[PDB]
Structures are given as C-alpha cells and as structure tokens.
Design an enzyme around this catalytic site. Structure first.
Site, PDB file in Angstrom:
ATOM      1  CG  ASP A   1      -2.434  -4.259   0.627  1.00 12.35           C
ATOM      2  OD1 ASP A   1      -2.105  -3.791   1.733  1.00 12.35           O
ATOM      3  OD2 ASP A   1      -1.656  -4.905  -0.115  1.00 12.35           O
TER       4      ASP A   1
ATOM      5  CB  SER B   1       4.137   5.216  16.713  1.00 17.09           C
ATOM      6  OG  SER B   1       3.709   5.051  18.052  1.00 17.09           O
TER       7      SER B   1
END
Length: 330
Positions: free
Chosen positions: A35, A199
C-alpha cells in the site's frame, strides 16, 4: 541488494493485489497488500481477536526465534474507506522477493474491522508511503522500504500491476524490459506523507487533451481512480446511460456499454487507461447496472491515482533524497 516479488489480484475485479512476504525464523509466509498510501506493516496474528479471523494466515511471533516484543509500542490506523485495525508491535526479520530487512517493525493486530475479517485473501498490509505516516506510538517506526533503502543497489521500488493478471514489485532496480518507450519523471511532495504529484491533464477516449493541473497521490492500496467531479462528469458523459447514483455510492453505467479510454498526463507524456480497466462489473450479482472505475474525489479531500490508473503504467517510486515518481507505458 535487490528484491523482486510477484503481486496477484485477489479476485476477478482486481479489487486489490497480494504479495507474499516472509516474516520470522523459520519463515512464516503471509500474503500482504502493498500500500503506497500508508506506512504501517501490520498482520493478522495469533493475537487477533478470534472472532475477527476468518480464513487469513496468521503470524505467530512465539514461533519465530527472531521475534522480539517492542516493549510498550502500540498502533492504531484508520483508512480512507473507513476500515481500521490496531494492536501491539514486534520486531522481526522480513523478506520480500529475496530482499531481507532485519529488525523490521511488524505490527500485530489485536483488532481488525469487519472489512478485513471478511476478506480471507489479505493477511495484512505492507505500507510504502513515507514513514512520517507510521502510527506506532510512542516511537514511530520505519517502513520496509525505508529500512531497506541504504542496502538497495538504487533507492527505488517499482510497481507493475497487472490487469486481471499478476504483476511485479521490484526493490532496488528498474527492470528496463518491463516497459515501453521512456520513463517520465515528475516531482513529489512529501508534505502529507504520500507519493503526491501533479498530473498535467486528461483526455476522454479519442478526445482532445485538456491541460490542467491535478494534484493527487499514487496509491496502490486504493482500487479505483478518484478525480475531481468536473473530470469525472466529462468522462461519464461519454457513456450512454451512465449516471451518478447516491444509493449505490458512485457512477454506474449499463453493463451493455463499451467504455472509452481515459488518458492522464505525466509531464508531456501520456498514460492511456483502456476502457475495460474502468469496468468493475455488476453492482450486485446478476444486475445489468455496472460500477465505474473512475469516481469523484469530492469529499475525499484528495485525488487518488489508485490501481485503475497505476496498472496502466510501469511506476517508479524513487526514494532518493529528493523523491520523484516515474511513469512509463507498458
């Protein structure tokens, strides 16, 4: 040193991925959920409330000659999906794919929430976010990666998740045969303890690319792609009959649909998520309403590049003094 381990979807939807991990002496092998959005290595154990164990493999520290109670240490964690666990702590030898750390904090669960009990395939979590998020008290502990880092050939790990198929986590090297083209690296903020990056935009299907900054986290422990409501609405508007359902808890679409791809930007580079990766199947067995793999982050408080996004790429988690993230097509 290096390590290399195969990671395998737990079910036909890629809800999560499990990777075998050797703990203790002699080895006890548990299948853990790696994770990158948390920083605790915790396991089902001989100490876990019996009624909360349902098919998991447990770690039994009393059978490990290298286990030592970390006296006074406790841990307690709550995840973004509302699940939780807590317990005490041992140090022991932990190996992943041939890479061994001695003195790793192994957090032994005394209590786990129902979601964990109900998932027989996940024996615990191995956190790979920054150690500043580790919940051990009163002495915070380091992640497996942080402990391994100085011994690694290069201070990196890579995630290469499969679509409905196995993939690989590598530690300490970049497998140049595992991706196509070049890797594009992008800046990371560690201010919130996550692999947080920005992004450069998105496209839906064959549509034009929209240049826009989307700050989010690379999180292997989250199944879906959670993005701003504007972005998600633009995606689902291209699927006839799709709608957001408050009763179901997100966007659903007719199972008869063909889903468009979704592209996200990494600098000047582009990662394309095929439409099929966005299909999470019937909302309930036999339903003709299907659950979407791109959902709104509104009210999460953060955008999450979960498995839906990451499995479309070869992802480099660069733990150099100034960390960065790399993405390649594959």
């Amino acid at each position: 040193s290096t390590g290399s381990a195969t990671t395998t979807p737990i079910d036909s939807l890629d809800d999560a991925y499990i990777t075998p991990v050797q703990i203790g002496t002699p080895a006890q092998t548990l299948n853990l959920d790696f994770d990158t959005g948390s920083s605790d290595l915790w396991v089902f154990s001989s100490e876990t409330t019996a009624s909360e164990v349902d098919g998991q493999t447990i770690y039994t520290p009393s059978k490990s000659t290298t286990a030592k109670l970390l006296s006074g240490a406790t841990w307690s964690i709550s995840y973004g999906d509302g699940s939780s666990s807590s317990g005490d702590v041992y140090t022991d030898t932990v190996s992943v794919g041939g890479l061994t750390v001695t003195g790793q904090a192994v957090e032994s669960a005394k209590k786990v929430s129902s979601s964990f009990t109900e998932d027989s395939t996940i024996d615990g979590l191995l956190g790979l976010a920054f150690s500043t998020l580790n919940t051990v008290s009163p002495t915070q502990q380091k992640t497996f990666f942080d402990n391994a880092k100085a011994s690694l050939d290069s201070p990196v790990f890579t995630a290469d998740l499969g679509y409905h198929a196995p993939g690989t986590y590598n530690f300490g090297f970049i497998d140049t045969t595992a991706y196509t083209g070049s890797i594009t690296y992008t800046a990371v903020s560690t201010k919130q303890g996550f692999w947080e990056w920005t992004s450069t935009g998105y496209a839906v299907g064959s549509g034009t690319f929209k240049s826009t900054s989307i700050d989010g986290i690379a999180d292997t422990g989250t199944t879906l792609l959670y993005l701003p409501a504007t972005v998600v609405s633009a995606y689902w508007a291209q699927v006839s009959g799709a709608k957001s359902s408050s009763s179901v808890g997100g966007y659903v679409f007719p199972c008869s649909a063909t889903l468009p791809s979704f592209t996200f930007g990494v600098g000047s580079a582009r990662i394309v998520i095929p439409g099929d990766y966005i299909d999470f199947g019937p909302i309930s067995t036999g339903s003709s309403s299907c659950f979407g793999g791109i959902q709104s982050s509104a009210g999460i408080g953060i955008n999450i590049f979960g498995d839906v996004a990451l499995k479309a790429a070869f992802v480099v988690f660069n733990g150099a003094t100034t960390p960065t993230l790399g993405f390649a097509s594959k």
